[PDB]
Amino acid sequence: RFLKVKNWETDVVLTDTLHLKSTLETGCTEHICMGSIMLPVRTKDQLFPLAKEFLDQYYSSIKRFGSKAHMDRLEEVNKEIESTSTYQLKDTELIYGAKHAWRNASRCVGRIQWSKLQVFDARDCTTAHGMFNYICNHVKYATNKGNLRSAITIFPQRTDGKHDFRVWNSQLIRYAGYKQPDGSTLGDPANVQFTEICIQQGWKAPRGRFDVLPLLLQANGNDPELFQIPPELVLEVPIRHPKFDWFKDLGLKWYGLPAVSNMLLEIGGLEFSACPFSGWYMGTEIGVRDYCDNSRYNILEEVAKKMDLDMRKTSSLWKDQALVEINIAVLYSFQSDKVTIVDHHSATESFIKHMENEYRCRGGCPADWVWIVPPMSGSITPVFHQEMLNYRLTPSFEYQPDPWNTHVW
Amino acid sequence: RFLKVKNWETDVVLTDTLHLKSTLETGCTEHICMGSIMLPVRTKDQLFPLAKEFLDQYYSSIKRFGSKAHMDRLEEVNKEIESTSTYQLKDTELIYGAKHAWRNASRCVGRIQWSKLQVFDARDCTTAHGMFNYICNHVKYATNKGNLRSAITIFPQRTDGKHDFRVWNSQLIRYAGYKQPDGSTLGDPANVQFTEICIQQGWKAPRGRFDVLPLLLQANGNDPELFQIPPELVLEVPIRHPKFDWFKDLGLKWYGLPAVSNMLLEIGGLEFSACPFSGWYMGTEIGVRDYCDNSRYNILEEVAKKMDLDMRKTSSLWKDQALVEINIAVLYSFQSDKVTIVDHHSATESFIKHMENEYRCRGGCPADWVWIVPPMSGSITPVFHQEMLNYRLTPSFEYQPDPWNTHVWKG
Ligand code: HEM
Ligand code: HEM
Ligand SMILES: Cc1cc(N)nc(C[C@@H]2CNC[C@@H]2OCCN[C@@H]2C[C@H]2c2cccc(Cl)c2)c1
Ligand SMILES: Cc1cc(N)nc(C[C@@H]2CNC[C@@H]2OCCN[C@@H]2C[C@H]2c2cccc(Cl)c2)c1
Ligand SMILES: C[C@H](O)[C@H](O)[C@H]1CNc2nc(N)[nH]c(=O)c2N1
Ligand SMILES: C[C@H](O)[C@H](O)[C@H]1CNc2nc(N)[nH]c(=O)c2N1
Ligand SMILES: [Zn+2]
């Protein structure tokens, strides 16, 4: 229970002590590692230890641990739980909880930024229409005309769990997908289902390739409702290449704001089932994953053809060649249009710096190597050579299943 | 208990029951995953269970579980253990054991090949000179003039742990590394320490960028002895690029035969501390790791320079550009000289078909994702998208510390 991590490129060894404060289960056992499995109410009794654990860490953070003000809040929260079966966070607590859920997100390479997070408190929200208003304000604030700013917006916490707030979308901004008589897929094959659910709720799809999807918002356990985000709030980037004049003709674009909206924020045992958050893209996610995944826009073959490469044998590395050029183009387009983006070299470098800060100041940094190492050029980024320990700390973000599977109408 | 893995590209779901046969520990717990941590004598007492488990597996494999042959062999081994504290494997058991250790090796993408392995039984070897000869024969057989054949050579097992056979080299063929007084390195920085031991053991080093190291071989717990592999036996490939004609003048070459020599093979509780084995390269190992790791030959800068790439910002992806070209060159060069090599697209596709076949016939296939996914172009290979379960089956290969840290010098 005192663990070393070694970087094999630099020989730097760091000692992890933070893992001992870890609480939740990993999915791994002594006999089986589940490191690469993507997926490996609360009663009164369960809630007070959770609240106490959180308030202790909070009061510790502001150097008032064991102070009258610490004990008094523990007292206040205990009474409120006993009498109301739940409790409410102070603004200061909510801000701290959200920043720490990000600090603890072991799959997140950009956490050097964790303390610069603008938190929008949407706990007074009561309808879908209000949710939409909050989300547009989030979008406009975060986008900031291309100078992106990290933000989260936090809707009301769970109660009896039959009144959840949820954003049905997996991200605030994504593109539609429709399956055609042709048998192929137009637009984003990842969202075919969600797009069907939208149309059957009433969306009129402009039956195209890069149709920004409508929001489906569920306030207070109600049936969700549709809203189109103002087109003028969705900053999109046309994709061109600095050297390939034909590239623009693929007709590719992507949206500037990555904004995850399906997670559950847990703070001091309280559960925030709608907490859309956003930062800015690492270029590989668009160029490697969205564009080149087989099940996504799947554009390797068309780009390779346009480059006039040898597609007859895997060993000519035509896929690898086209992959790099696609990613040069994503970075180039975002940079030309002055929209914040980070390349994988720069993002992984800052993360190693972040890991070292966290090791000296905090005793560790939970990190999931399988997600942290970029989907291309892994071993030429410093994170490939860095041992990481993965463990679960709270406050946390947790993945929740798609609500259409669940919800009753 | 059943455990499922998903492929996120295909939605193919597989069910693992084989993990139930797993003995050793992973390093992970309910509270911590050590999946990216590189490193996470027996008594009679622990030995007969291990022997029994093994022979039961062997006898099942051949469809004679519970036969008189099976029961006779159990009795025979038990008696040998109580009487001598160890036991000897029959040839058939050794072969089966060394194949299964490969089969079980969760970090190996090449395992579709597992049933095709040449086993050289070197258990009669007694001296380092005898080890050299065995290793020469292995290299010649495996190389096969570029038509590479997988092989393993198995030296006598551990006895009291004071009489170990070991190959001090980490692979049979690697290049020397010389650390210069200015702090630069000539040749391979990975082999600096070992090169320095060779030299101290009396090696006359040529001091160039690609000097094949001498074998340093330890027999029967004795101090290791130096041998030069006959150069005519060391197949090498000069590295050139199909389109860039300046690439040859970087002066690069690599050896054709990757041959891991530092691992410990465990079969049925017995420990084979010298068991060099070899297959053939996947190109990325040379082109990504050996050439492009910063702590190795580190050629990215020189290549990208010659390619006239924009090097002022990482966002030009100049490193990634130079990386692909170097890997094209490695594959082209090997193919042009008719030396077996597999590209990472081909090897991963084959591995997925192997893993799937194993789930159907064996009830699973332990795989270490962190190692199986190639160190370039990860997500455009099918393995990236494949959930894997990592666990430890015997027979097995295990890492062992370098012997210069443990050896009792006899002088
Ligand atoms: C500011 C720039 C940021 C960068 C460059 C960044 C980078 C990334 C990347 C590349 C991923 C992988 C996503 C994927 O592969 O789908 C990720 C995952 C994640 N990040 Fe960040 N991040 C940023 C901001 C944020 C913020 C503001 C939060 C929360 C407050 C956050 C929390 C998370 C979480 C919880 C995941 C895992 C998502 C999942 O399980 O689907 N990140 N991060
Ligand atoms: C036949 C062609 C083969 C190919 C293409 C192949 C591919 C690979 C690759 C790329 C690695 C990772 C190497 C590294 O990163 O250092 C590996 C690891 C490994 N393979 Fe293979 N392999 C082959 C044959 C074999 C054979 C013949 C054996 C033993 C009989 C073997 C057992 C292992 C073991 C134990 C590891 C883990 C090595 C370690 O921990 O350092 N492989 N395989
Ligand atoms: C089954 C499953 C589990 C989990 N935990 N996540 C997913 C979502 C799956 C997992 N990686 C792909 C897909 O995510 C796409 C969304 N990417 C984030 C937008 C990008 C991003 C980038 C930078 C900053 C931020 Cl805030 C967000 C699926
Ligand atoms: C600390 C440590 C632990 C372990 N388990 N292995 C290592 C050796 C580390 C692990 N990746 C780098 C270094 O290996 C270089 C040798 N690679 C084998 C040549 C390649 C190979 C390729 C194809 C077929 C075969 Cl039989 C063998 C180091
Ligand atoms: C099975 C495997 O865990 C899965 O493909 C993972 C691999 N690593 C990843 N890494 C990131 N950042 N995002 C992902 O979606 C994935 N997918
Ligand atoms: C820290 C990390 O586990 C380490 O760098 C690993 C990652 N994956 C690897 N994969 C292979 N094939 N070989 C390696 O040496 C490594 N090194
Ligand atoms: Zn694990």
Side-chain angles (χ1 to χ4, degrees):
Chain A
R1 53 170 286 153
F2 253 73
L3 300 164
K4 304 294 176 79
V5 282
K6 171 166 173 162
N7 181 298
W8 291 86
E9 181 191 340
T10 67
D11 273 358
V12 176
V13 187
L14 303 172
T15 310
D16 192 301
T17 50
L18 184 69
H19 73 277
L20 292 169
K21 298 140 231 281
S22 131
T23 193
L24 291 164
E25 290 169 9
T26 52
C28 304
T29 76
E30 306 93 85
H31 294 253
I32 198 147
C33 180
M34 290 205 158
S36 64
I37 312 312
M38 280 187 70
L39 299 153
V41 276
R42 216 146 267 162
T43 42
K44 313 202 205 210
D45 304 9
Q46 315 158 136
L47 185 50
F48 196 70
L50 294 174
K52 182 157 174 308
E53 188 206 354
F54 171 73
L55 299 172
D56 287 358
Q57 64 172 75
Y58 174 71
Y59 278 86
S60 189
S61 77
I62 69 172
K63 301 185 298 145
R64 288 196 144 35
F65 187 88
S67 63
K68 200 173 169 303
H70 180 194
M71 295 307 292
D72 286 345
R73 158 107 283 220
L74 228 50
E75 177 62 2
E76 170 175 63
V77 165
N78 196 264
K79 306 169 187 284
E80 179 173 342
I81 289 168
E82 250 297 312
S83 157
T84 70
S85 79
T86 179
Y87 73 106
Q88 299 300 318
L89 292 172
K90 302 286 178 203
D91 295 359
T92 47
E93 299 170 352
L94 188 73
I95 290 160
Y96 174 94
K99 286 176 188 197
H100 280 73
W102 185 14
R103 201 197 191 160
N104 296 343
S106 73
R107 294 170 162 163
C108 179
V109 77
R111 281 179 276 168
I112 192 166
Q113 287 289 331
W114 72 274
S115 65
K116 299 174 292 266
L117 179 61
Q118 169 55 229
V119 176
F120 291 116
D121 182 352
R123 288 172 295 165
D124 67 3
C125 183
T126 70
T127 66
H129 265 93
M131 284 180 78
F132 170 71
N133 192 51
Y134 273 114
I135 287 155
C136 292
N137 290 346
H138 179 127
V139 174
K140 189 182 182 162
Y141 175 86
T143 308
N144 186 34
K145 315 183 175 287
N147 193 190
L148 308 201
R149 289 183 296 203
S150 292
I152 176 159
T153 293
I154 298 154
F155 295 101
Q157 68 209 38
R158 272 225 179 99
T159 46
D160 57 19
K162 265 192 185 175
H163 304 175
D164 293 2
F165 287 73
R166 286 300 293 278
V167 176
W168 285 32
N169 318 55
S170 62
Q171 296 173 52
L172 295 179
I173 301 163
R174 294 201 90 170
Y175 294 123
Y178 322 81
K179 40 192 279 296
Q180 318 200 283
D182 202 30
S184 57
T185 301
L186 173 67
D188 197 327
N191 299 320
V192 156
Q193 211 180 20
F194 182 76
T195 302
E196 258 149 358
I197 286 156
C198 294
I199 299 169
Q200 121 204 291
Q201 290 304 101
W203 193 46
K204 44 197 180 315
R207 211 174 167 80
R209 189 183 189 204
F210 286 106
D211 297 341
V212 174
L213 282 159
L215 289 167
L216 249 186
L217 319 170
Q218 154 184 322
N220 204 225
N222 292 322
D223 291 354
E225 300 168 53
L226 274 188
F227 298 88
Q228 194 72 60
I229 303 186
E232 71 274 32
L233 297 182
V234 189
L235 171 51
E236 286 181 296
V237 174
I239 307 305
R240 57 274 195 199
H241 196 280
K243 298 163 65 289
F244 299 130
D245 286 353
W246 51 258
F247 199 103
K248 63 186 93 303
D249 296 327
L250 293 152
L252 310 162
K253 66 177 135 164
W254 208 253
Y255 50 85
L257 189 70
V260 168
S261 65
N262 61 181
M263 284 173 99
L264 191 150
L265 170 52
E266 183 198 308
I267 301 164
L270 306 167
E271 292 184 298
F272 296 97
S273 48
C275 62
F277 58 83
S278 57
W280 55 78
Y281 266 119
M282 177 169 74
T284 53
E285 171 160 2
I286 302 160
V288 185
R289 308 303 310 286
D290 303 320
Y291 286 165
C292 298
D293 264 19
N294 189 186
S295 60
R296 294 300 296 299
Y297 280 89
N298 186 207
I299 72 169
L300 272 177
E301 271 207 27
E302 312 160 67
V303 176
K305 277 179 156 57
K306 279 268 186 69
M307 289 176 62
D308 206 27
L309 303 174
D310 190 18
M311 288 171 79
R312 296 175 295 175
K313 31 166 257 143
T314 61
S315 42
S316 81
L317 311 194
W318 61 269
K319 285 199 169 147
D320 307 71
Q321 275 188 308
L323 180 66
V324 180
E325 306 301 320
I326 288 158
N327 280 271
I328 282 165
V330 162
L331 290 165
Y332 172 74
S333 297
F334 271 69
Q335 288 165 168
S336 293
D337 278 357
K338 302 172 166 189
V339 180
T340 307
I341 196 165
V342 71
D343 69 74
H344 52 290
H345 297 288
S346 158
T348 48
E349 189 204 0
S350 318
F351 183 73
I352 283 311
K353 223 206 175 214
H354 175 62
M355 263 191 78
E356 300 165 332
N357 293 323
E358 295 290 73
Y359 272 86
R360 43 161 190 97
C361 310
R362 205 187 181 201
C365 182
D368 176 344
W369 190 97
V370 172
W371 281 53
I372 296 294
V373 169
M376 66 182 255
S377 295
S379 69
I380 71 161
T381 71
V383 294
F384 184 92
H385 308 272
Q386 178 64 56
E387 293 180 335
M388 298 176 189
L389 291 163
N390 194 197
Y391 47 94
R392 329 228 300 155
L393 299 174
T394 193
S396 51
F397 291 106
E398 307 282 14
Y399 170 92
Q400 47 195 343
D402 291 339
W404 53 85
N405 297 310
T406 314
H407 184 70
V408 291
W409 294 78
Chain B
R1 213 196 347 92
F2 284 13
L3 286 168
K4 304 193 285 73
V5 294
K6 178 171 191 158
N7 189 295
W8 285 92
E9 202 194 325
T10 60
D11 280 0
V12 165
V13 187
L14 300 171
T15 303
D16 185 294
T17 53
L18 188 61
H19 66 275
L20 295 171
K21 299 322 179 195
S22 183
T23 36
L24 303 121
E25 285 168 357
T26 52
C28 299
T29 72
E30 269 90 340
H31 292 118
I32 200 154
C33 168
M34 309 208 315
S36 64
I37 312 296
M38 294 205 53
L39 303 149
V41 45
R42 284 196 171 93
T43 319
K44 332 153 144 314
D45 171 53
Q46 48 222 178
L47 186 63
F48 187 82
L50 298 168
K52 178 177 199 293
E53 181 205 354
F54 177 67
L55 296 165
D56 286 354
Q57 284 149 201
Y58 174 68
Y59 274 92
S60 286
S61 86
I62 57 161
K63 292 205 201 49
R64 307 284 186 272
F65 183 96
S67 61
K68 200 190 183 302
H70 182 192
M71 300 292 131
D72 283 351
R73 182 59 181 148
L74 294 177
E75 198 189 310
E76 176 185 60
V77 159
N78 182 217
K79 280 172 77 271
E80 195 174 331
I81 293 181
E82 75 184 270
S83 149
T84 74
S85 262
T86 184
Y87 71 101
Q88 294 300 316
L89 285 186
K90 295 268 187 252
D91 290 0
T92 39
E93 288 163 359
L94 188 80
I95 284 165
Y96 168 94
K99 279 174 188 196
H100 275 76
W102 184 8
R103 202 186 181 171
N104 292 341
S106 76
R107 294 168 159 175
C108 177
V109 74
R111 283 176 291 170
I112 190 159
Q113 290 289 338
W114 78 273
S115 69
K116 185 170 184 207
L117 174 64
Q118 178 62 219
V119 182
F120 297 110
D121 180 351
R123 293 171 297 169
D124 67 1
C125 184
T126 64
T127 59
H129 265 99
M131 289 185 63
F132 180 63
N133 192 63
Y134 266 118
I135 286 167
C136 286
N137 294 342
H138 175 149
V139 170
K140 196 181 180 158
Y141 174 93
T143 301
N144 185 31
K145 312 211 172 143
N147 185 196
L148 277 31
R149 294 182 284 201
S150 312
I152 175 166
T153 296
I154 307 171
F155 294 104
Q157 69 211 46
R158 178 161 295 155
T159 53
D160 59 359
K162 297 172 156 190
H163 291 81
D164 288 0
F165 285 70
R166 298 289 296 270
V167 178
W168 284 34
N169 307 64
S170 61
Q171 303 160 60
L172 296 182
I173 296 151
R174 294 196 98 189
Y175 301 117
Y178 311 83
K179 158 89 100 133
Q180 293 295 104
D182 71 12
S184 68
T185 305
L186 178 67
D188 196 337
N191 300 320
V192 164
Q193 214 191 3
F194 178 77
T195 304
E196 270 179 333
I197 289 157
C198 290
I199 288 163
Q200 179 214 173
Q201 295 316 307
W203 192 52
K204 319 295 173 202
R207 305 190 47 87
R209 185 153 76 130
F210 290 107
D211 304 337
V212 177
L213 289 161
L215 294 167
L216 194 46
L217 314 167
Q218 163 177 332
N220 203 217
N222 289 308
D223 296 352
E225 312 174 22
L226 276 175
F227 303 93
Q228 183 200 112
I229 304 184
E232 66 264 43
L233 259 44
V234 178
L235 182 57
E236 292 178 292
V237 185
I239 309 292
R240 61 279 193 188
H241 190 274
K243 290 206 264 283
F244 303 135
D245 205 39
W246 50 259
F247 197 110
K248 77 187 176 280
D249 303 301
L250 294 159
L252 309 171
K253 61 174 147 176
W254 205 252
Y255 48 85
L257 183 77
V260 171
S261 57
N262 60 354
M263 284 184 96
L264 182 153
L265 166 58
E266 170 183 331
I267 302 172
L270 306 172
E271 313 190 288
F272 297 93
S273 55
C275 63
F277 59 85
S278 58
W280 49 83
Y281 270 115
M282 178 161 86
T284 53
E285 186 165 344
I286 313 162
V288 190
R289 312 298 315 284
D290 302 322
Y291 288 155
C292 296
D293 277 14
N294 304 140
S295 295
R296 305 285 310 286
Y297 279 88
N298 190 211
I299 68 175
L300 283 176
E301 243 141 311
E302 177 156 39
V303 170
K305 272 207 214 297
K306 273 159 210 324
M307 282 176 71
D308 192 46
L309 298 177
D310 186 349
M311 285 174 73
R312 302 171 297 167
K313 43 183 125 43
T314 66
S315 59
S316 61
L317 304 193
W318 65 265
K319 290 205 195 189
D320 314 66
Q321 250 172 346
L323 182 56
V324 172
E325 297 299 346
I326 289 150
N327 280 270
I328 285 173
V330 168
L331 287 156
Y332 176 68
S333 285
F334 269 65
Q335 280 166 176
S336 292
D337 295 355
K338 308 192 158 77
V339 180
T340 316
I341 194 154
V342 71
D343 68 73
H344 56 286
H345 300 290
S346 186
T348 54
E349 192 187 351
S350 295
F351 179 80
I352 285 306
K353 293 171 171 206
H354 169 65
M355 183 186 177
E356 294 189 348
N357 181 53
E358 293 274 80
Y359 271 84
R360 287 179 212 115
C361 79
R362 210 191 178 194
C365 174
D368 178 342
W369 195 95
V370 169
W371 285 53
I372 296 297
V373 174
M376 72 175 286
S377 306
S379 92
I380 60 154
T381 73
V383 293
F384 183 90
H385 300 276
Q386 183 66 53
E387 295 189 345
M388 289 170 198
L389 291 170
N390 196 200
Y391 49 90
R392 281 172 39 163
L393 300 173
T394 55
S396 60
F397 297 102
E398 291 294 327
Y399 187 77
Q400 50 183 350
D402 294 326
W404 50 93
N405 295 313
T406 64
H407 186 69
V408 179
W409 284 89
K410 295 174 181 194

